[PDB]
Amino acid sequence: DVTNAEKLVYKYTNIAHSANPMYEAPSITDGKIFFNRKFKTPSGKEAACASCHTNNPANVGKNIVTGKEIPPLAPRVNTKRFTDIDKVEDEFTKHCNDILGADCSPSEKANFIAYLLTETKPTK
Ligand code: HEC
């Protein structure tokens, strides 16, 4: 739920700030840029988190590889997101690995989840 997401924001912020002293607090802007930024897959095709999750994490997404729908990521809309916070940290590390080839950095996770807490409205 939102509570659990908000607590992982603190956790990742504090990790990031230890590693990277100039990072002090989450940036919702940078979290949004990261979610929408086009990166280059090995093939040269560009993709973004938004390719599957849409440009609004409050909406239902669709996996471009399988065509399968994906529940919304924004915990205010889909309150099951971040229900088992331990499980979630492992899943998200695995998921970063799968999508990007390596884990997301602690500041990317803090910024991203912070951004998610701001998206409470599905695009209509
Ligand atoms: C399709 C190829 C995807 C792209 C590109 C990204 N994500 Fe994804 N995401 C996708 C699936 C099939 C799932 C699992 C099904 C489900 O309902 O959970 C996810 C899940 C997430 C989650 C939930 C937690 C988790 O399972 O790790 C998060 C927070 C998430 N995705 C974030 C995310 C980010 C930040 C991405 C860019 C780096 C990204 N996803 C890309 C499908 C796809």
Short mmCIF file of all heavy atoms in Angstrom, two decimals, residues 18-77:
data_model
loop_
_atom_site.label_atom_id
_atom_site.label_comp_id
_atom_site.label_asym_id
_atom_site.label_seq_id
_atom_site.Cartn_x
_atom_site.Cartn_y
_atom_site.Cartn_z
N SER A 18 24.23 7.71 1.86
CA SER A 18 25.49 7.09 2.28
C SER A 18 26.51 6.88 1.13
O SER A 18 27.71 7.18 1.29
CB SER A 18 25.23 5.78 2.99
OG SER A 18 26.46 5.11 3.36
N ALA A 19 26.01 6.36 0.00
CA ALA A 19 26.81 6.10 -1.20
C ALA A 19 27.22 7.32 -1.99
O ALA A 19 28.26 7.31 -2.69
CB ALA A 19 26.07 5.16 -2.12
N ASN A 20 26.38 8.35 -1.88
CA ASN A 20 26.38 9.47 -2.82
C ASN A 20 25.99 10.69 -2.02
O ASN A 20 24.81 11.08 -2.00
CB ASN A 20 25.39 9.20 -3.96
CG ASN A 20 25.39 10.28 -5.04
OD1 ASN A 20 26.14 11.29 -5.01
ND2 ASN A 20 24.51 10.07 -6.01
N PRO A 21 26.96 11.26 -1.32
CA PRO A 21 26.67 12.31 -0.34
C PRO A 21 25.88 13.47 -0.86
O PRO A 21 25.15 14.05 -0.09
CB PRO A 21 28.06 12.71 0.19
CG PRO A 21 28.84 11.33 0.09
CD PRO A 21 28.38 10.83 -1.29
N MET A 22 26.01 13.81 -2.12
CA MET A 22 25.25 14.95 -2.64
C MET A 22 23.74 14.69 -2.88
O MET A 22 22.96 15.64 -3.03
CB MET A 22 25.92 15.46 -3.90
CG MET A 22 27.30 16.22 -3.53
SD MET A 22 27.92 16.94 -5.02
CE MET A 22 26.57 18.14 -5.45
N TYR A 23 23.35 13.43 -2.86
CA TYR A 23 21.95 13.10 -2.92
C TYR A 23 21.37 13.15 -1.51
O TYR A 23 21.80 12.39 -0.62
CB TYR A 23 21.82 11.71 -3.47
CG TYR A 23 20.41 11.28 -3.59
CD1 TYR A 23 19.67 11.62 -4.71
CD2 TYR A 23 19.81 10.51 -2.59
CE1 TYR A 23 18.36 11.18 -4.86
CE2 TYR A 23 18.48 10.11 -2.71
CZ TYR A 23 17.78 10.45 -3.85
OH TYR A 23 16.49 10.04 -4.02
N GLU A 24 20.44 14.04 -1.27
CA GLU A 24 19.93 14.21 0.09
C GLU A 24 18.48 13.83 0.28
O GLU A 24 18.08 13.45 1.39
CB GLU A 24 20.10 15.68 0.55
CG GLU A 24 21.57 16.07 0.73
CD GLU A 24 21.74 17.49 1.21
OE1 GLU A 24 20.85 18.35 0.96
OE2 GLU A 24 22.78 17.75 1.87
N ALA A 25 17.69 13.95 -0.79
CA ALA A 25 16.23 13.75 -0.71
C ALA A 25 15.74 13.36 -2.07
O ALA A 25 16.34 13.76 -3.08
CB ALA A 25 15.53 15.04 -0.26
N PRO A 26 14.66 12.60 -2.15
CA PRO A 26 14.13 12.22 -3.47
C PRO A 26 13.70 13.41 -4.36
O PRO A 26 13.24 14.50 -3.90
CB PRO A 26 12.90 11.34 -3.15
CG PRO A 26 12.75 11.32 -1.66
CD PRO A 26 13.88 12.05 -1.01
N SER A 27 13.91 13.21 -5.65
CA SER A 27 13.47 14.13 -6.67
C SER A 27 12.34 13.46 -7.49
O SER A 27 12.61 12.51 -8.19
CB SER A 27 14.59 14.49 -7.64
OG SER A 27 14.01 15.14 -8.77
N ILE A 28 11.13 13.98 -7.41
CA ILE A 28 9.96 13.43 -8.11
C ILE A 28 10.15 13.64 -9.60
O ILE A 28 9.82 12.79 -10.42
CB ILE A 28 8.64 14.12 -7.62
CG1 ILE A 28 8.02 13.40 -6.43
CG2 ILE A 28 7.57 14.04 -8.65
CD1 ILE A 28 8.95 13.01 -5.41
N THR A 29 10.71 14.78 -9.94
CA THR A 29 11.12 15.08 -11.31
C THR A 29 12.07 14.05 -11.90
O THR A 29 11.89 13.59 -13.04
CB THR A 29 11.86 16.45 -11.31
OG1 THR A 29 10.91 17.48 -11.02
CG2 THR A 29 12.40 16.75 -12.74
N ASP A 30 13.11 13.73 -11.16
CA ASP A 30 14.05 12.76 -11.70
C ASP A 30 13.41 11.36 -11.80
O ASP A 30 13.75 10.60 -12.71
CB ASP A 30 15.30 12.66 -10.86
CG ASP A 30 16.22 13.91 -11.01
OD1 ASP A 30 16.04 14.77 -11.89
OD2 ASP A 30 17.14 14.06 -10.20
N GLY A 31 12.55 11.02 -10.82
CA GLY A 31 11.81 9.75 -10.87
C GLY A 31 10.96 9.68 -12.11
O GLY A 31 10.91 8.65 -12.75
N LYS A 32 10.27 10.79 -12.46
CA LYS A 32 9.47 10.79 -13.68
C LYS A 32 10.33 10.70 -14.95
O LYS A 32 9.99 10.01 -15.91
CB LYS A 32 8.58 12.05 -13.75
CG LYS A 32 7.56 12.06 -14.88
CD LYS A 32 6.77 13.44 -14.88
CE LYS A 32 5.74 13.48 -16.02
NZ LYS A 32 4.42 14.11 -15.57
N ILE A 33 11.46 11.38 -14.96
CA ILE A 33 12.32 11.37 -16.15
C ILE A 33 12.77 9.93 -16.37
O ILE A 33 12.72 9.40 -17.49
CB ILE A 33 13.51 12.30 -15.90
CG1 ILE A 33 13.04 13.77 -16.01
CG2 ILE A 33 14.72 11.95 -16.84
CD1 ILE A 33 14.12 14.82 -15.56
N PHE A 34 13.22 9.31 -15.29
CA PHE A 34 13.70 7.92 -15.30
C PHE A 34 12.63 6.94 -15.84
O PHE A 34 12.95 6.03 -16.59
CB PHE A 34 14.09 7.52 -13.86
CG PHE A 34 14.36 6.02 -13.64
CD1 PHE A 34 15.65 5.47 -13.90
CD2 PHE A 34 13.39 5.20 -13.07
CE1 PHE A 34 15.94 4.10 -13.63
CE2 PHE A 34 13.65 3.83 -12.83
CZ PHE A 34 14.94 3.29 -13.09
N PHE A 35 11.38 7.09 -15.38
CA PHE A 35 10.24 6.23 -15.78
C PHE A 35 9.97 6.41 -17.29
O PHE A 35 9.62 5.44 -17.94
CB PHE A 35 8.98 6.60 -15.01
CG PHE A 35 7.78 5.76 -15.33
CD1 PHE A 35 7.74 4.40 -14.98
CD2 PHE A 35 6.62 6.37 -15.88
CE1 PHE A 35 6.58 3.66 -15.21
CE2 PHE A 35 5.51 5.64 -16.12
CZ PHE A 35 5.49 4.27 -15.82
N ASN A 36 10.14 7.62 -17.83
CA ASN A 36 9.83 7.90 -19.25
C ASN A 36 11.05 7.85 -20.22
O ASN A 36 10.87 7.78 -21.43
CB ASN A 36 9.04 9.24 -19.41
CG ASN A 36 7.65 9.19 -18.79
OD1 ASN A 36 6.70 8.63 -19.38
ND2 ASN A 36 7.52 9.73 -17.56
N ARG A 37 12.27 7.83 -19.67
CA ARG A 37 13.48 7.97 -20.49
C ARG A 37 13.66 6.77 -21.43
O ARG A 37 13.51 5.62 -21.00
CB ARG A 37 14.70 8.09 -19.59
CG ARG A 37 16.05 7.86 -20.29
CD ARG A 37 17.20 7.58 -19.32
NE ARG A 37 17.35 8.69 -18.40
CZ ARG A 37 17.49 8.63 -17.06
NH1 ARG A 37 17.53 7.47 -16.40
NH2 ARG A 37 17.61 9.79 -16.39
N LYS A 38 14.00 7.05 -22.70
CA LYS A 38 14.19 5.97 -23.68
C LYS A 38 15.60 5.46 -23.54
O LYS A 38 16.56 6.24 -23.60
CB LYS A 38 13.87 6.47 -25.10
CG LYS A 38 12.33 6.64 -25.22
CD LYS A 38 11.85 7.35 -26.43
CE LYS A 38 10.45 6.82 -26.84
NZ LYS A 38 9.37 7.00 -25.78
N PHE A 39 15.76 4.17 -23.27
CA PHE A 39 17.09 3.63 -23.23
C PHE A 39 17.23 2.67 -24.42
O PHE A 39 16.27 2.38 -25.13
CB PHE A 39 17.36 2.91 -21.90
CG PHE A 39 16.26 1.96 -21.49
CD1 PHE A 39 16.18 0.69 -22.05
CD2 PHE A 39 15.32 2.32 -20.54
CE1 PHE A 39 15.12 -0.20 -21.67
CE2 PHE A 39 14.31 1.42 -20.14
CZ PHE A 39 14.21 0.19 -20.73
N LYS A 40 18.44 2.22 -24.66
CA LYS A 40 18.75 1.46 -25.89
C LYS A 40 18.89 0.05 -25.42
O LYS A 40 19.73 -0.21 -24.59
CB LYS A 40 20.06 1.98 -26.49
CG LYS A 40 20.55 1.22 -27.70
CD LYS A 40 21.82 1.86 -28.29
CE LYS A 40 22.26 1.19 -29.57
NZ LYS A 40 23.39 2.00 -30.21
N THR A 41 18.06 -0.84 -25.96
CA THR A 41 18.22 -2.29 -25.77
C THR A 41 19.35 -2.78 -26.64
O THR A 41 19.76 -2.04 -27.55
CB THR A 41 16.92 -3.03 -26.18
OG1 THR A 41 16.63 -2.79 -27.57
CG2 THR A 41 15.71 -2.46 -25.42
N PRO A 42 19.88 -3.96 -26.35
CA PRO A 42 21.01 -4.51 -27.10
C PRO A 42 20.79 -4.44 -28.61
O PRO A 42 21.73 -4.10 -29.32
CB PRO A 42 21.09 -5.95 -26.60
CG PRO A 42 20.64 -5.82 -25.19
CD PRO A 42 19.47 -4.87 -25.25
N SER A 43 19.57 -4.75 -29.04
CA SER A 43 19.19 -4.68 -30.46
C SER A 43 19.27 -3.28 -31.08
O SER A 43 19.29 -3.18 -32.31
CB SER A 43 17.74 -5.19 -30.64
OG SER A 43 16.81 -4.23 -30.13
N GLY A 44 19.35 -2.23 -30.26
CA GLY A 44 19.31 -0.87 -30.80
C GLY A 44 17.92 -0.26 -30.74
O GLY A 44 17.77 0.93 -30.85
N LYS A 45 16.89 -1.07 -30.48
CA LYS A 45 15.50 -0.57 -30.30
C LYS A 45 15.41 0.18 -28.98
O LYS A 45 15.98 -0.25 -27.98
CB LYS A 45 14.54 -1.79 -30.25
CG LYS A 45 13.02 -1.50 -29.89
CD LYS A 45 12.32 -0.69 -30.94
CE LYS A 45 10.87 -0.34 -30.52
NZ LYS A 45 9.84 -1.22 -31.12
N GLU A 46 14.73 1.33 -28.98
CA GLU A 46 14.60 2.09 -27.75
C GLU A 46 13.39 1.63 -26.96
O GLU A 46 12.38 1.18 -27.52
CB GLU A 46 14.46 3.58 -28.02
CG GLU A 46 15.63 4.22 -28.73
CD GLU A 46 15.39 5.72 -28.87
OE1 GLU A 46 14.22 6.11 -29.16
OE2 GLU A 46 16.35 6.50 -28.65
N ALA A 47 13.50 1.71 -25.65
CA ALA A 47 12.38 1.31 -24.80
C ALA A 47 12.45 2.20 -23.56
O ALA A 47 13.51 2.86 -23.30
CB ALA A 47 12.51 -0.14 -24.44
N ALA A 48 11.38 2.17 -22.77
CA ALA A 48 11.24 2.94 -21.53
C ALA A 48 10.41 2.10 -20.54
O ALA A 48 9.71 1.16 -20.96
CB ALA A 48 10.57 4.33 -21.80
N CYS A 49 10.50 2.39 -19.23
CA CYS A 49 9.57 1.75 -18.28
C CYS A 49 8.14 1.98 -18.80
O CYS A 49 7.29 1.14 -18.69
CB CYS A 49 9.69 2.40 -16.91
SG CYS A 49 11.39 2.49 -16.33
N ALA A 50 7.92 3.16 -19.37
CA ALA A 50 6.64 3.54 -19.90
C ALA A 50 6.17 2.74 -21.11
O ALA A 50 4.97 2.70 -21.40
CB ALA A 50 6.62 5.11 -20.20
N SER A 51 7.09 2.02 -21.78
CA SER A 51 6.68 1.16 -22.88
C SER A 51 5.66 0.11 -22.38
O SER A 51 4.66 -0.19 -23.05
CB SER A 51 7.90 0.45 -23.44
OG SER A 51 8.79 1.44 -23.97
N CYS A 52 5.88 -0.45 -21.20
CA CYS A 52 4.94 -1.42 -20.71
C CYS A 52 4.00 -0.82 -19.66
O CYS A 52 2.86 -1.31 -19.51
CB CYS A 52 5.68 -2.59 -20.02
SG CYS A 52 6.72 -3.45 -21.22
N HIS A 53 4.46 0.16 -18.89
CA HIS A 53 3.61 0.62 -17.78
C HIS A 53 2.71 1.84 -18.16
O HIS A 53 1.98 2.34 -17.30
CB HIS A 53 4.47 0.89 -16.57
CG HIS A 53 5.05 -0.36 -15.99
ND1 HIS A 53 4.27 -1.36 -15.41
CD2 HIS A 53 6.33 -0.81 -15.92
CE1 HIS A 53 5.06 -2.32 -14.94
NE2 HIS A 53 6.31 -2.03 -15.27
N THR A 54 2.78 2.27 -19.43
CA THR A 54 2.25 3.55 -19.97
C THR A 54 2.94 4.76 -19.38
O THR A 54 3.75 4.64 -18.46
CB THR A 54 0.64 3.70 -19.85
OG1 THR A 54 0.28 4.17 -18.53
CG2 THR A 54 -0.06 2.33 -20.01
N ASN A 55 2.63 5.94 -19.88
CA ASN A 55 3.24 7.13 -19.30
C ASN A 55 2.56 7.61 -18.01
O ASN A 55 2.91 8.65 -17.45
CB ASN A 55 3.37 8.22 -20.37
CG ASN A 55 2.02 8.78 -20.77
OD1 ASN A 55 1.01 8.47 -20.15
ND2 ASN A 55 1.99 9.60 -21.83
N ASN A 56 1.60 6.82 -17.54
CA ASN A 56 0.89 7.07 -16.26
C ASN A 56 0.87 5.76 -15.45
O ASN A 56 0.11 4.83 -15.76
CB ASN A 56 -0.57 7.55 -16.51
CG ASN A 56 -1.30 8.06 -15.19
OD1 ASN A 56 -2.41 8.72 -15.24
ND2 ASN A 56 -0.71 7.79 -14.05
N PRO A 57 1.67 5.70 -14.38
CA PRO A 57 1.71 4.49 -13.55
C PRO A 57 0.40 4.19 -12.81
O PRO A 57 0.23 3.09 -12.28
CB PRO A 57 2.90 4.73 -12.63
CG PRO A 57 3.03 6.19 -12.57
CD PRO A 57 2.58 6.73 -13.87
N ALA A 58 -0.50 5.15 -12.71
CA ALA A 58 -1.87 4.87 -12.21
C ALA A 58 -2.72 4.06 -13.22
O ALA A 58 -3.81 3.58 -12.87
CB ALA A 58 -2.59 6.23 -11.82
N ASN A 59 -2.28 3.91 -14.47
CA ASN A 59 -3.06 3.12 -15.41
C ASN A 59 -2.65 1.65 -15.52
O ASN A 59 -1.58 1.27 -15.08
CB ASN A 59 -3.04 3.78 -16.80
CG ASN A 59 -3.87 5.08 -16.81
OD1 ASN A 59 -5.05 5.08 -17.18
ND2 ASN A 59 -3.29 6.14 -16.30
N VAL A 60 -3.51 0.85 -16.14
CA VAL A 60 -3.19 -0.53 -16.46
C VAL A 60 -2.23 -0.58 -17.64
O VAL A 60 -2.45 0.08 -18.65
CB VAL A 60 -4.47 -1.33 -16.79
CG1 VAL A 60 -4.12 -2.76 -17.26
CG2 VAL A 60 -5.35 -1.36 -15.57
N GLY A 61 -1.15 -1.34 -17.47
CA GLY A 61 -0.11 -1.43 -18.47
C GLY A 61 -0.29 -2.67 -19.29
O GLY A 61 -1.29 -3.40 -19.19
N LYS A 62 0.65 -2.88 -20.19
CA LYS A 62 0.63 -4.05 -21.05
C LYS A 62 2.07 -4.40 -21.43
O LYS A 62 2.79 -3.56 -21.92
CB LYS A 62 -0.19 -3.83 -22.31
CG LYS A 62 -0.18 -5.09 -23.25
CD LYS A 62 -1.30 -5.10 -24.30
CE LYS A 62 -1.07 -4.10 -25.40
NZ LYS A 62 -2.39 -3.49 -25.83
N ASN A 63 2.46 -5.64 -21.17
CA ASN A 63 3.81 -6.13 -21.44
C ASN A 63 3.96 -6.19 -22.96
O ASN A 63 3.23 -6.95 -23.61
CB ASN A 63 3.89 -7.53 -20.85
CG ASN A 63 5.29 -8.15 -20.92
OD1 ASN A 63 5.70 -8.89 -20.02
ND2 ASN A 63 6.00 -7.88 -21.99
N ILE A 64 4.88 -5.40 -23.53
CA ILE A 64 5.07 -5.40 -24.98
C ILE A 64 5.58 -6.73 -25.53
O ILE A 64 5.51 -6.97 -26.74
CB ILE A 64 6.03 -4.24 -25.44
CG1 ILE A 64 7.44 -4.46 -24.84
CG2 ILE A 64 5.46 -2.92 -25.04
CD1 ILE A 64 8.48 -3.53 -25.41
N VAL A 65 6.12 -7.60 -24.67
CA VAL A 65 6.66 -8.86 -25.16
C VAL A 65 5.55 -9.94 -25.26
O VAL A 65 5.55 -10.76 -26.17
CB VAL A 65 7.85 -9.33 -24.29
CG1 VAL A 65 8.31 -10.78 -24.67
CG2 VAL A 65 9.05 -8.33 -24.36
N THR A 66 4.60 -9.93 -24.30
CA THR A 66 3.56 -10.95 -24.23
C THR A 66 2.16 -10.49 -24.54
O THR A 66 1.27 -11.34 -24.69
CB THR A 66 3.51 -11.59 -22.85
OG1 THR A 66 3.17 -10.59 -21.87
CG2 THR A 66 4.82 -12.10 -22.47
N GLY A 67 1.92 -9.18 -24.63
CA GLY A 67 0.55 -8.66 -24.73
C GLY A 67 -0.32 -8.73 -23.45
O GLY A 67 -1.46 -8.27 -23.45
N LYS A 68 0.22 -9.23 -22.36
CA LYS A 68 -0.52 -9.41 -21.13
C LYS A 68 -0.65 -8.07 -20.38
O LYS A 68 0.33 -7.31 -20.26
CB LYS A 68 0.23 -10.40 -20.29
CG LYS A 68 -0.35 -10.66 -18.94
CD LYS A 68 0.21 -11.98 -18.35
CE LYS A 68 0.30 -11.91 -16.86
NZ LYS A 68 -0.44 -13.07 -16.26
N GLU A 69 -1.87 -7.80 -19.87
CA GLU A 69 -2.09 -6.58 -19.07
C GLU A 69 -1.32 -6.56 -17.72
O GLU A 69 -1.01 -7.59 -17.15
CB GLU A 69 -3.61 -6.33 -18.89
CG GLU A 69 -4.17 -5.76 -20.21
CD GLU A 69 -5.57 -5.14 -20.16
OE1 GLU A 69 -6.46 -5.65 -19.43
OE2 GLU A 69 -5.77 -4.13 -20.88
N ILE A 70 -0.98 -5.36 -17.24
CA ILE A 70 -0.21 -5.27 -16.00
C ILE A 70 -0.94 -4.36 -15.09
O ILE A 70 -1.26 -3.25 -15.47
CB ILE A 70 1.26 -4.74 -16.23
CG1 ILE A 70 1.98 -5.58 -17.29
CG2 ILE A 70 2.10 -4.79 -14.89
CD1 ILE A 70 3.28 -4.91 -17.80
N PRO A 71 -1.22 -4.80 -13.88
CA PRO A 71 -1.87 -3.88 -12.93
C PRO A 71 -1.04 -2.61 -12.75
O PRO A 71 0.19 -2.63 -12.90
CB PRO A 71 -1.96 -4.68 -11.66
CG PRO A 71 -2.01 -6.10 -12.17
CD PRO A 71 -1.00 -6.15 -13.32
N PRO A 72 -1.74 -1.53 -12.41
CA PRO A 72 -1.10 -0.25 -12.16
C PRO A 72 -0.02 -0.37 -11.11
O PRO A 72 -0.12 -1.21 -10.17
CB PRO A 72 -2.25 0.61 -11.61
CG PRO A 72 -3.46 0.04 -12.21
CD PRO A 72 -3.21 -1.48 -12.20
N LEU A 73 0.98 0.49 -11.23
CA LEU A 73 2.05 0.51 -10.26
C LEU A 73 1.78 1.46 -9.05
O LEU A 73 2.37 1.27 -7.98
CB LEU A 73 3.35 0.95 -10.94
CG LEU A 73 3.96 0.08 -12.09
CD1 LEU A 73 5.36 0.67 -12.53
CD2 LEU A 73 4.09 -1.32 -11.66
N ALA A 74 0.99 2.52 -9.27
CA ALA A 74 0.80 3.59 -8.27
C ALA A 74 0.02 3.03 -7.09
O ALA A 74 -1.08 2.54 -7.29
CB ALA A 74 0.09 4.80 -8.89
N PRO A 75 0.63 2.99 -5.91
CA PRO A 75 0.02 2.30 -4.75
C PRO A 75 -1.25 2.97 -4.25
O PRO A 75 -2.00 2.32 -3.51
CB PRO A 75 1.12 2.30 -3.66
CG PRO A 75 2.05 3.47 -4.04
CD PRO A 75 1.97 3.55 -5.62
N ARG A 76 -1.49 4.23 -4.61
CA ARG A 76 -2.79 4.80 -4.20
C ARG A 76 -3.91 4.25 -5.05
O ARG A 76 -5.03 4.17 -4.60
CB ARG A 76 -2.85 6.32 -4.24
CG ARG A 76 -4.33 6.80 -3.93
CD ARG A 76 -4.72 6.83 -2.44
NE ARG A 76 -6.17 6.68 -2.20
CZ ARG A 76 -6.96 7.64 -1.69
NH1 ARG A 76 -6.45 8.83 -1.35
NH2 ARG A 76 -8.26 7.40 -1.51
N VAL A 77 -3.62 3.87 -6.28
CA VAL A 77 -4.65 3.30 -7.15
C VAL A 77 -4.75 1.79 -6.99
O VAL A 77 -5.87 1.21 -6.91
CB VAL A 77 -4.36 3.66 -8.59
CG1 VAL A 77 -5.43 3.14 -9.50
CG2 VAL A 77 -4.32 5.09 -8.71
#
